[PDB]
Amino acid sequence: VQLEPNITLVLKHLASCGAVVSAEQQAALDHSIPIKRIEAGLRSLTLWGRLTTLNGKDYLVAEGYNVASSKEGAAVYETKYFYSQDGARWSDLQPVDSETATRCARIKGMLSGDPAKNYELELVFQIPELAVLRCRVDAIATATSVIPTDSTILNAASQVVPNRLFAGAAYPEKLESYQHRFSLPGSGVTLSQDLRGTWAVQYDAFKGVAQVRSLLFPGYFFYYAANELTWGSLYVGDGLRNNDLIFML
Amino acid sequence: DKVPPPAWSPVFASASVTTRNQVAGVRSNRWPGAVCACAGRHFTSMYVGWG
Amino acid sequence: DVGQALAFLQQVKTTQGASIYEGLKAALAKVLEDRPVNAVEALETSVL
Amino acid sequence: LEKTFALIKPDAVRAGKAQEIMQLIELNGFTIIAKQKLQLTRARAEEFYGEHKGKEFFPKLVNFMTSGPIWALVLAKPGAILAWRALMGPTNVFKARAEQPKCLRALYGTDGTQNATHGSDSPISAAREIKFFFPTLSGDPTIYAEPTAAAEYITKRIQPALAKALAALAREKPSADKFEAITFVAGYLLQNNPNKPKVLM
Amino acid sequence: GKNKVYPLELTLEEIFHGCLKKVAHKRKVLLFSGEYVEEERQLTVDVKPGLPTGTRFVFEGEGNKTPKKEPGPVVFVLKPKPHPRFVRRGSDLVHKVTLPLHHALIGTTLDIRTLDDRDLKVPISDIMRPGSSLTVPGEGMPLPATPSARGNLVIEIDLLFPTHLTETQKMLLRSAFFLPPPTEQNEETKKALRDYEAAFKHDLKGWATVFKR
Amino acid sequence: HDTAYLKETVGEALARGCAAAISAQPNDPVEYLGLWLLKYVKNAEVEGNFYRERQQDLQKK
Amino acid sequence: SVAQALAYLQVHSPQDGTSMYDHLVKLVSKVLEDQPKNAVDLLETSLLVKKSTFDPKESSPLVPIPVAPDATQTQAAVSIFGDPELPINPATGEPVPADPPNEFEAENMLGAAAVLDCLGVGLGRELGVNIALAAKRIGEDPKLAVRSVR
Amino acid sequence: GRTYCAFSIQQSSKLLGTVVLELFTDIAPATCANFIKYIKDGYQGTPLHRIVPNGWVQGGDIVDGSGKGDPGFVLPDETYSVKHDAPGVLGMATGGQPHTANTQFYISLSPLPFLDGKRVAFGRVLNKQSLENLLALQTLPTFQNERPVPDVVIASCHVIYNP
């Protein structure tokens, strides 16, 4: 039904789960989001999430893309990520190479405020904080990107496009009604094929709103209102991973 | 890093330090989701999140 | 000529069970009435 | 059903009346086959205005045509050319205001050269301009698809290179399979042809 | 075996996008008259996106025609016109920006308008060394071989150091450059730092933000 | 003789290419024809590739 | 009627590079060339034609220009949120001469917006934040020396 | 995965050797088919006509067997793809102009840069023994004006590895 999740609806439905933004930052978001969508070539830019930090200047992260094709049996989005301490001015997040991608997963802890911070590892390796910031966003999006099933379909030239005739998913409480965004529409891969205890779903049968929370990544929330057929997701908190999931459950 | 993080971190309500009436507070790092806010004579503490 | 092509098209059937002429006519009528956003993509995506 | 070429000049653009012009065009029964916002350079404008070469108004016309982006549009209607000219109105804005006040020249034009719009005149010029600005836009399947016209085109455009390519293929005599010979002749045609040069680096 | 070589100046935008230039050639044919007679020929050259500098386009059979020998080919050598922002170095662009010292240290976002009609805001990831550089992948000239991949935009940083510094400014710089680690700071040190930060970011009488006159 | 070789080697597709060129009326018919022949030799394998992919997908389902 | 339908079908789609009329002509031509004795598949034929259409992508004499709505108003609206950094003179590298914010007397506009929202009147909290920021911009101007902003 | 054909060389009631050839049935199918048909019905006793020391071993005439052209068929030129660059390359010989080819065949005994583009080559030797047989045949005791003084005659021939 919808073609792009809203910023007001996501911030409204996820307010209960603590996924909220500063009131001043909310006002700046309404103005500077369309500006960044035109300065860059992106045609669909939304707010991916907000990562906390040792200071009060949380990293507001926005994700946008132009083309979304299907190659090697997996739908790939040429996503572009932007970061901003406040909602006024956005900067860009460059991708990182494989050698740094392995040396950034060992830096556990909480990110600092100034994006010009360098961490040290072992000879000494100097890694910028923005590289660490990009790694955590990529790791979270790899395992948590959740969209309703059959919401995207394949057309000619192998492009995944929104299903304009989507009629919603029956039994929204079941995990089989949601799939990863990079899963091909034909493939029957859903959140059920993941680890059994990773995802928990709380569905309000009366108001027709469902909430999906990741236990592997506790800061990720996704909602899906069946009545109005709107879905959106956001991430709050740090981007660390819950390694010892077996003990928690 | 070799510097242990502090247990509490500041939280602001505006990106400008010249706002006339801006609320400010602290946020606990040991227990995530615990916040304290203060504006003049009105102070409050609240814990929302996972225990 | 054109009549030969029309007569040929009225004989060949299709997996859906109708002739190519009737199927294309129905698809064109559906496209004309609906007026989709992207007509060319909608031909292969929705109306067929 | 015919089609004609028409462009919205930069004078009708800088004030943002292009959307209103398109809405009026749609309200008057026309249909936009293709539209494109684009800015001409000096050489492109001079080539486009080739008919009025060496005229007294040519310098000011070409200077004005490249002062801002225009909109290029193709309009389709059974009586497209004459209907577009009637909606166009008189060639002079001052005369248009007196004659038909409810015409695009009176509503948006401000000067004899700044009539805010330009249109085709004759079907041949319209086809030429449509080919000039939209090379990939198909059309005119009757004048081009004629036996004598096709023979004349083949004789004087593709034959001089095709004969040499086929002679080279006959001399070389590659493998009897279709694909290798087709690839060889296509490579020769794209390698040495009269109009295009050879690229070296 | 002589050939006429002509420069062909193209802008960086034309090279990036792929232009279709029409050039005029003055061909001279020798006749019995004492003076020559010449004609103007129109040649269409199709430059592909991101062709390397120095590309030669040769038109065979076009050139001055002596009565006996067939005229030799004419050569067009592709060169780029100067650009206010970017100078190309092979397959990727190079941008030279003058950077403030405090920008280099604290960290700011350089603003670059690409050859394509897109803005770009590239943050400073660390303390920019003197003579160092920054790289933004996938923001340069497209590869001549493949029409999808591009080079990487290179920002060459030339620091702009402040001209004058007062004694109190130097004292503050020394304090900032020799501040102890936060695990070693005294309670008095922390209190003084908090007081100074509050006084510097004072909303009405602080100099954290000011309006230009 | 050699005309038979030419006719049953390049004769069939050349007529279709010439018809496409005269229908399109491009600016460089000689350049248009060559790219047309490259596309003509390219699409023959990809149509079978598409058939194979569709059959494999149906079998997997 | 029929002319309108024909024009609508001949409307050229920019991104796809072809029109309904051209696609239908190509499909019917391919069917006529095939002369299929067995059953056909409209979806299969349409996809195969779409993948087999020749698309000559030649260069264009003019560099593309972008179409985009004006952003001056939105940029001005954004410029009030964050305090602008003081620009420096490139010749000297030092910040340009500036003035401190002007001292003015205004009420608690955020509290006023909260009270209005509680009562059920006013302009809303989202606009109240913008109004407060704009009032701060007006008051802090040293050239526009004001004593009170309301 | 081509067709193979073997034949024996014998001079004056004395067996000189045997040779085996592979036919490029995927390069020159018509020439290969004609060569197989003639080796099935023909080449049974045709003497080796022309023997160049550092050139080629030539022969294979049917109706005359001494170097004149034969009637009843003319083989058109098929394709110039195999390049004469290594010894033991089998091809057909034609007149001074194309589309006059006959049963007359030749086997190269040395790299032949000049012969490409003029003679249709559609076969090759298999092993070193077959090439050494021709190399030894080069140094016959007496051969008069590029023809062996005795009758070097094809003793037998057959086809293998492919119907």
From Swiss-Prot, chain B:
Which compartments does it reside in?
A: Cytoplasm, Cytoskeleton, Flagellum axoneme
| Asymmetric dimethylarginine sites (modified residues) | 41
Q: How is it modified after translation?
A: Probably methylated by PRMT1.
| Disulfide cysteine pairs (residue numbers) | none
Q: Which residues form a coiled coil?
A: none
Reading the lineage from the top rank, the first entry is Eukaryota
Record's family? Belongs to the flagellar radial spoke RSP4/6 family.
Role according to the record: Flagellar radial spokes contribute to the regulation of dynein arm activity and thus the pattern of flagellar bending. They consist of a thin stalk, which is attached to the a subfiber of the outer doublet microtubule, and a bulbous head, which is attached to the stalk and appears to interact with the projections from the central pair of microtubules.
**Assembly behavior:** The radial spoke head is made of five different polypeptides (RSP1, RSP4, RSP6, RSP9, and RSP10).
- Write down what this protein is called: Flagellar radial spoke protein 6
To which species is this protein native? Chlamydomonas reinhardtii (Chlamydomonas smithii)
- Recite the lineage of the species: Eukaryota, Viridiplantae, Chlorophyta, core chlorophytes, Chlorophyceae
What range of the full-length protein does this chain span? 358 to 408 of 459
UniProtKB/Swiss-Prot annotation, chain F:
Q: How is it modified after translation?
A: Probably methylated by PRMT1.
Query: Upon deletion of the gene, what happens?
Result: Absence of radial spokes.
- Localization (cell): Cytoplasm, Cytoskeleton, Flagellum axoneme
Q: Specify the domain of life of the species encoding this protein.
A: Eukaryota
Q: Which family does it belong to?
A: Belongs to the dpy-30 family.
Other facts: In-gel analysis assays show kinase-like activity in vitro. However, such activity has not been confirmed using recombinant protein.
Q: What does this protein do?
A: Flagellar radial spokes contribute to the regulation of dynein arm activity and thus the pattern of flagellar bending. They consist of a thin stalk, which is attached to the a subfiber of the outer doublet microtubule, and a bulbous head, which is attached to the stalk and appears to interact with the projections from the central pair of microtubules. Binds calmodulin in a calcium-dependent manner.
The protein, known as: Flagellar radial spoke protein 2
Species annotation? Chlamydomonas reinhardtii
Taxonomy, top ranks, is: Eukaryota, Viridiplantae, Chlorophyta, core chlorophytes, Chlorophyceae
The gene behind this protein is RSP2
Full protein segment contained here: 8 to 68 of 738
